[PDB]
C-alpha cells in the first residue's frame, strides 16, 4: 500500500511528462516524451493513452488520476507486459538487444544521470551471456529481480 515516499517517486514520474508544471499531462506533452523515447505515436494513439488514465474525461491527466493508475499497476506484480513495454522503450532499433548506447540514451531522457562507467556496470550486471548487450530474457531477470 501507498507511502509518503512512494508518492514522491510517482510525482517524480509525473513531472517528467508535465513539462510546464501546470499540474496536468496533455496530449501534446505525452507526444514530446514519447518521441524523446524513440516512439512516434499518432495523435489518435496519444489520445487513447491519455483516455486510459483520464478518469473524469476532461481530456488531460492530473496527478490524482496518474496516482490512481500507477498505484494500481503497482499492486499488480504479474505485469509481464509492463516489463516488455519497458524493454521496447530501451530497444530503439527493435533488434531484441539493448546496447550500451540505447540504455544510456533512455536514461539521459528519463531524467537520469549515468556516467559511461555506470552505464557499463549496469549492463555488465545483467549481461548473463556476456555479449555486452541485454537481451529480453536478461532484461526480465534484471527487472523482476531487485
Amino acid at each position: 500500500q501507498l507511502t509518503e515516499e512512494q508518492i514522491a517517486e510517482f510525482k517524480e514520474a509525473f513531472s517528467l511528462f508535465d513539462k510546464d508544471g501546470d499540474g496536468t499531462i496533455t496530449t501534446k506533452e505525452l507526444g514530446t516524451v514519447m518521441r524523446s523515447l524513440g516512439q512516434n505515436p499518432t495523435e489518435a494513439e496519444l489520445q487513447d493513452m491519455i483516455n486510459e488514465v483520464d478518469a473524469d474525461g476532461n481530456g488531460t491527466i492530473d496527478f490524482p488520476e496518474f496516482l490512481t493508475m500507477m498505484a494500481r499497476k503497482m499492486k499488480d506484480t504479474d505485469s509481464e507486459e509492463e516489463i516488455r513495454e519497458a524493454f521496447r522503450v530501451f530497444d530503439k532499433d527493435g533488434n531484441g538487444y539493448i546496447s550500451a548506447a540505447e540504455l544510456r540514451h533512455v536514461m539521459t531522457n528519463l531524467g537520469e544521470k549515468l556516467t559511461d562507467e555506470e552505464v557499463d556496470e549496469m549492463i555488465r550486471e545483467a549481461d548473463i551471456d556476456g555479449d555486452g548487450q541485454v537481451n529480453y530474457e536478461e532484461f526480465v531477470q534484471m527487472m523482476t529481480a531487485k
Binding site: 500507477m70 519497458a86 522503450v89
Partner: peptide, 21 residues
Amino acid sequence: KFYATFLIQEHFRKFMKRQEE
C-alpha cells in the same frame, strides 16, 4: 508508457543503492 517509464526509473533507483553500499 507511463508505468513502463516508472519501472525504468525505479530500476535505476535500485541500482544507485546497490552502488551506494
